[PDB]
Amino acid sequence: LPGKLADCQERDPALSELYLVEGDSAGGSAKQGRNRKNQAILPLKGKILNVEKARFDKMLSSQEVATLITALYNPDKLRYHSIIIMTDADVDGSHIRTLLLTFFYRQMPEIVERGHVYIAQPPLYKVKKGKQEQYIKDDEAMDQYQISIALDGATLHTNASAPALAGEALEKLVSEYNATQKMINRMERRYPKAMLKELIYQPTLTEADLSDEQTVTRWVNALVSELNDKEQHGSQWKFDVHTNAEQNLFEPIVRVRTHGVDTDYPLDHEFITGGEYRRICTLGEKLRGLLEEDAFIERGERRQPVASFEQALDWLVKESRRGLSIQRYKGLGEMNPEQLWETTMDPESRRMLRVTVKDAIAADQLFTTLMGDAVEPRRA
Amino acid sequence: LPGKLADCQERDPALSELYLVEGDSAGGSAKQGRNRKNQAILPLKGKILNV
Amino acid sequence: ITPVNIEEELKSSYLDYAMSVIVGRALPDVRDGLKPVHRRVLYAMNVLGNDWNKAYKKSARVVGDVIGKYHPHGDSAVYDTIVRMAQPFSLRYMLVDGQGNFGSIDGDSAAAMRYTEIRLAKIAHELMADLEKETVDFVDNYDGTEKIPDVMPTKIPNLLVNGSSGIAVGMATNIPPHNLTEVINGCLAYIDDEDISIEGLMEHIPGPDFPTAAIINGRRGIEEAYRTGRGKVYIRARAEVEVDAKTGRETIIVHEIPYQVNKARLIEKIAELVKEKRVEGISALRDESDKDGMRIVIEVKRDAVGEVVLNNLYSQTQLQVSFGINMVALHHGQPKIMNLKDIIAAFVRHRREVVTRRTIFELRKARDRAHILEALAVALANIDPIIELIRHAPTPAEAKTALVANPWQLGNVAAAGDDAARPEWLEPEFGVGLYYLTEQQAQAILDLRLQKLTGLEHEKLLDEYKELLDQIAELLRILGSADRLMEVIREELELVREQFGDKRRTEITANSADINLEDLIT
Amino acid sequence: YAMNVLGNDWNKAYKKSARVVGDVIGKYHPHGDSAVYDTIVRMAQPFSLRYMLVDGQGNFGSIDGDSAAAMRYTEIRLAKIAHELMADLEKETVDFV
Amino acid sequence: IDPIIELIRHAPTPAEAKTALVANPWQLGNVAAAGDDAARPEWLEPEFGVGLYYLTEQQAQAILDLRLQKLTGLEHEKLLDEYKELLDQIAE
Numbered sequence A: 001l002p003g004k005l006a007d008c009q010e011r012d013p014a015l016s017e018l019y020l021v022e023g024d025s026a027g028g029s030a031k032q033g034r035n036r037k038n039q040a041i042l043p044l045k046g047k048i049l050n051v052e053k054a055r056f057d058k059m060l061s062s063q064e065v066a067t068l069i070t071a072l073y074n075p076d077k078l079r080y081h082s083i084i085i086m087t088d089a090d091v092d093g094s095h096i097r098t099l100l101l102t103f104f105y106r107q108m109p110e111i112v113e114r115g116h117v118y119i120a121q122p123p124l125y126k127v128k129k130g131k132q133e134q135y136i137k138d139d140e141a142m143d144q145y146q147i148s149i150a151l152d153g154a155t156l157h158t159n160a161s162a163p164a165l166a167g168e169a170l171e172k173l174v175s176e177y178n179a180t181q182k183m184i185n186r187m188e189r190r191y192p193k194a195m196l197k198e199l200i201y202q203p204t205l206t207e208a209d210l211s212d213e214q215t216v217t218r219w220v221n222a223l224v225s226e227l228n229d230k231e232q233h234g235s236q237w238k239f240d241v242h243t244n245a246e247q248n249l250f251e252p253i254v255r256v257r258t259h260g261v262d263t264d265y266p267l268d269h270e271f272i273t274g275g276e277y278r279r280i281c282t283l284g285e286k287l288r289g290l291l292e293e294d295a296f297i298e299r300g301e302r303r304q305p306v307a308s309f310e311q312a313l314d315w316l317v318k319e320s321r322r323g324l325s326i327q328r329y330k331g332l333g334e335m336n337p338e339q340l341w342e343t344t345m346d347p348e349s350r351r352m353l354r355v356t357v358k359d360a361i362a363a364d365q366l367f368t369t370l371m372g373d374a375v376e377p378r379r380a
Numbered sequence B: 001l002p003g004k005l006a007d008c009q010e011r012d013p014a015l016s017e018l019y020l021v022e023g024d025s026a027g028g029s030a031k032q033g034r035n036r037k038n039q040a041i042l043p044l045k046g047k048i049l050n051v
Numbered sequence C: 001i002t003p004v005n006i007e008e009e010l011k012s013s014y015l016d017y018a019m020s021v022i023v024g025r026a027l028p029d030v031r032d033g034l035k036p037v038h039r040r041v042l043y044a045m046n047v048l049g050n051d052w053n054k055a056y057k058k059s060a061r062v063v064g065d066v067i068g069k070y071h072p073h074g075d076s077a078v079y080d081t082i083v084r085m086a087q088p089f090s091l092r093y094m095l096v097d098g099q100g101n102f103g104s105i106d107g108d109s110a111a112a113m114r115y116t117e118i119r120l121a122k123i124a125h126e127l128m129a130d131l132e133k134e135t136v137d138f139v140d141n142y143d144g145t146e147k148i149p150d151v152m153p154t155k156i157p158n159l160l161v162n163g164s165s166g167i168a169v170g171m172a173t174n175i176p177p178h179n180l181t182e183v184i185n186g187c188l189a190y191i192d193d194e195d196i197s198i199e200g201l202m203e204h205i206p207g208p209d210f211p212t213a214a215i216i217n218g219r220r221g222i223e224e225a226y227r228t229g230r231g232k233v234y235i236r237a238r239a240e241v242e243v244d245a246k247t248g249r250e251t252i253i254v255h256e257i258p259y260q261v262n263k264a265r266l267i268e269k270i271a272e273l274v275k276e277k278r279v280e281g282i283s284a285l286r287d288e289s290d291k292d293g294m295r296i297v298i299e300v301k302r303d304a305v306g307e308v309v310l311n312n313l314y315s316q317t318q319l320q321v322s323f324g325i326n327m328v329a330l331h332h333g334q335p336k337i338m339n340l341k342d343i344i345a346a347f348v349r350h351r352r353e354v355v356t357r358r359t360i361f362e363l364r365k366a367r368d369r370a371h372i373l374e375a376l377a378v379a380l381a382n383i384d385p386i387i388e389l390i391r392h393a394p395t396p397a398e399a400k401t402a403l404v405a406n407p408w409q410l411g412n413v414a415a416a417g418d419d420a421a422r423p424e425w426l427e428p429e430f431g432v433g434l435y436y437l438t439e440q441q442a443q444a445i446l447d448l449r450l451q452k453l454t455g456l457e458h459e460k461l462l463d464e465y466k467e468l469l470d471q472i473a474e475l476l477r478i479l480g481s482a483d484r485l486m487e488v489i490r491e492e493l494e495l496v497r498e499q500f501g502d503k504r505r506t507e508i509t510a511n512s513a514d515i516n517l518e519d520l521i522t
Numbered sequence D: 001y002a003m004n005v006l007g008n009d010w011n012k013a014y015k016k017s018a019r020v021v022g023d024v025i026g027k028y029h030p031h032g033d034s035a036v037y038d039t040i041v042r043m044a045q046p047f048s049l050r051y052m053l054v055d056g057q058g059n060f061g062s063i064d065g066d067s068a069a070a071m072r073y074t075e076i077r078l079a080k081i082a083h084e085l086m087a088d089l090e091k092e093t094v095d096f097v
Numbered sequence E: 001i002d003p004i005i006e007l008i009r010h011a012p013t014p015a016e017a018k019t020a021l022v023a024n025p026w027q028l029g030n031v032a033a034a035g036d037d038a039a040r041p042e043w044l045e046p047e048f049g050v051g052l053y054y055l056t057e058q059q060a061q062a063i064l065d066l067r068l069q070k071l072t073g074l075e076h077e078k079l080l081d082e083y084k085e086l087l088d089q090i091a092e
Ligand SMILES: O=c1ccc2ncc(=O)n3c2n1C[C@H]3CN1CCC(NCc2cc3c(cn2)OCCC3)CC1
Pocket: C060, C063, C064, C075, C113, D018, D019, D021, D022, D025, D033, D071
């Protein structure tokens, strides 16, 4: 009871709150920025031993949490009906959160079934552009904010049917382009990036082109020529036509020569049928149906004509990222106490989280097995 | 005599030596550079209260 | 606002933490065999500028710098890593040359971080050689304010020379050290024959190496480890019996202890075993270790052969311990069991790529320098018209415009290769005698001094131009042909082997097969 | 003097205190780390001096007796009034030791 | 400037050019020409700056370290203004 626990003035349960953070790093500012009416904080020290790896009714080091929350059995004493676990946004924070969750799950299932365990969501990014401030907590939110700042009322002027291309259509086009570039960066682990970036401007391809050899030859010749033209590093590009079929089944083959070893990349029916290639072809057709050679976009007092859409996008991002400031908090004991009160534990501005007891599965059984921990990593 | 004072092989007094230095900073290298025949070193901890 | 969430967040956070620990904390790489902590420490020491031929520096400054810029994850881990790199008996080849209490085999910890003085060594400069020549990629720091090199342009396969012992969330690795000369010989043999067999590599490299000598007995274990990736090997200490010329008594001498063995704990365990009657034939125990070599003296009990007691000790005392060989590392950011040939091939490919990128960088630099020197020589050819143009133009911008717009005569005294003397971005509308200037060229001309008008600068400029021509020709030749690049790699490897050669420390006495095979199949 | 040589003005970004502590220990004050950090915390507390000199950011304690955080979380820098203390130093105005 | 041009173009060695600049006096044109004193350092010997004028090894080295951009119709007025400002500053 003494030492670390700092209760509130109110003694009636179901009205106060309990928190669990790092003691010396966080609890100091937490107590200096909390309220003295219905706030209570229980500091912690390091990590907590696992339950399944070493199960012993006599093994105990701290024992303060279970002794202060209940009597350890629990229906009698139900003090602190509402508990919230604040935790850092680092990986060790997620680890200790997982340990705390499995602890409260394997010790007292009733307090979790009745909806008493809560999870906080502290902010992650602090963007300040002069007077304009912004609190961002997620990576996707940060990306959306960057896209919004990079498109502060842009207006494109090309020689297409639209004299002044602007509005939500350009935003949707940029979003689809970013999603496709992310997909290409994800698939880059399999195939090189040069061909995937070049197929954006190259003409379309159809499985009906396997009849005429001249069309495939012209296509692969244009591909190899443009790759050799755009190649500024120490590499080359060669073409190859092979017939492994009954009559034709024409399949192009690209031969690239890196530093010391050549490597081919044949094309099969499965590659043409695949949904990724179809999406790439649709995006390429959509971009070629724009005629974006002579373009004029301004954001917001200057414009510069370019010859590539990605170059204009990079220029806009660079112009938007000139004089902005970003502060990333990597710990609760880094920000001011008033900022913590306003952004994390403000009863009118906080955003808590509720845990459920939907299903009882054997995930905790495979948590520490040395076999489940080896078969689970199937992130490929 | 737990841990800290490492006596020598000889047990007859008036032949061995005793030393008093800082424990963590000095005693390590002192024991790593001393002899194991007639040498003994007792570490210390900070200061000592006055009499 | 209390949104209802599912329990799957537990598994999600656990998977995220496991992936993070496996990728960025535990498992090293195969191209250099270095942890990110060691990488950040070496990069900080390189940026600070603490060479081997300089004075010592306090370790607290380096630790604080590393914590402030690159590794903000405590202080104890960085200091422990520095102490481990400073211990000679912990690595086959030390990297950080220090001075102070660095611990010993007795288990005594090092002193505080306010007493020791450390600096880089001669071999450490070979690890991060040719780094500023744009040879590798840069990675942003935690807040996006600095740059960190992805890999180091190394010349020595530290993964095979020293190795490491780390454990992931579900994986673990352990690699014994080796000798540098045999690794260089194996690399040269692999360069000679791309289709070399495992038997040839085993013949080139008999077995591992250790900072402290020992006796290796198992050969099938290391053979399976080199062939598959898993195996066990036994380590035996060096000892013998002693009989005086007179009646005397028998005495056992311990010259060396196995790898990673505490001496004080070993003596305590031996004393406990003698007290517990578990071991016989031992009367007392003494010690004669000094600054000339470790020496342990054990008095053999009277009327005892001592060989049976020695065998009982070898069976019970920690002098004979196994070893968990396990080769696990990252190949493309994913744990993959790799053999020796794959590591050698990856090292060769990395070296080829680094050499090629360095050559391209040097070629671009020489091209730019020669392009500037050509304009400088053209300006030095005709000077008087430039004098009138400067004296009559009130504005320097107007003078630059007049210099760029007006052609020149291209005197006979001013006047190489057919091509490769101009940058790629330069437009063909310049340098068609006839000659035209450039804004950058005119700016460089306006930045000349008065000392460049002597009877000595012209010959120096001509010699520098000839040297640049020779350099760009040699670079084009080495980029055109790969055999020259392979010969350069071979020469560099031979030079490194000649500079950093040494002698074997350990010894391998094979008895696991001599006792088994010749007594089973005869 | 270490903060002046390092070049941490008031109109610049914050910096980690561990770097400054290590620099002071390495060059000028090699007498531990606890005293320097305690002095920095004392200079950072507004309720301990009539005019603060080191503008910081983080858990600097309060009147409740709670100690400050570790030296790997706080960020400190010079203030506007601190530049008036060491003004005109490189003009050979004092002696060197 | 022109005599300096011939002296630099005819002297193969820059040290010999500096020696020739220091040893030879100058004409001190009318366009080139302050206070009665306080315009010279204390360590300077009275044998320099007696029109008549002599150079110094440091002065000649500073002259040899000039560039081509200092020969416009804008540098002379800037130098005159800087000289007047230095006179005002040393007087104050
Ligand atoms: O935390 C504890 C708790 C109990 C305890 N008991 C004994 C003991 O020795 N120690 C105990 N401790 C811990 C340690 C004392 N600790 C004080 C802080 C010190 N910090 C080291 C340091 C860090 C930095 C330095 C210099 N020194 O300069 C650069 C910036 C970072 C390390 C030793």
